[PDB]
Amino acid sequence: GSPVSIKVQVPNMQDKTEWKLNGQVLVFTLPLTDQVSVIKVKIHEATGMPAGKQKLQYEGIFIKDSNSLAYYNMANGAVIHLALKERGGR
RNA sequence: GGGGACUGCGUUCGCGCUUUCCCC
Ligand code: NA
């Protein structure tokens, strides 16, 4: 497909001094056939935040690695919201 | 029996699994 602009809203998390979580909006250029996992790769390259630590949400949907951006009907200027994933357990 | 930190993960976002531990 044709590459589109996808935005990622990064958290503002200054206590995470190992990453660059400064509230910025990342702007990536990717085709709509690219999988959501590619967004995590590019977020890792820009913030240092590993993919396994990223929680992505698009229009309230917890988008999954194996689906393409087109699967979620993303378009130019779509904003993906990034959060820190927190693990649980008993 | 509670809370944390991790290593990876899953998730319906409620948490759950796991890995090293650390405490109360
Ligand atoms: Na719900």
Side-chain angles (χ1 to χ4, degrees), chain A residues 65-87:
Chain A
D65 278 359
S66 52
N67 287 328
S68 71
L69 310 184
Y71 181 85
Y72 293 109
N73 286 340
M74 290 187 199
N76 246 292
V79 175
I80 299 176
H81 293 271
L82 173 65
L84 174 60
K85 179 181 185 164
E86 281 176 23
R87 73 173 51 90

Side-chain angles (χ1 to χ4, degrees), chain A residues 29-89:
Chain A
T29 318
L30 340 85
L32 284 187
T33 52
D34 275 12
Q35 299 179 92
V36 166
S37 40
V38 177
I39 293 288
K40 293 189 184 164
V41 174
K42 296 202 121 67
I43 289 171
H44 178 240
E45 288 162 329
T47 63
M49 181 177 197
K53 307 235 72 180
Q54 300 175 26
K55 177 56 60 84
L56 299 184
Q57 190 167 216
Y58 171 73
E59 302 190 322
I61 295 171
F62 292 112
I63 57 185
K64 299 296 185 295
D65 278 359
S66 52
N67 287 328
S68 71
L69 310 184
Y71 181 85
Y72 293 109
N73 286 340
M74 290 187 199
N76 246 292
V79 175
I80 299 176
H81 293 271
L82 173 65
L84 174 60
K85 179 181 185 164
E86 281 176 23
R87 73 173 51 90

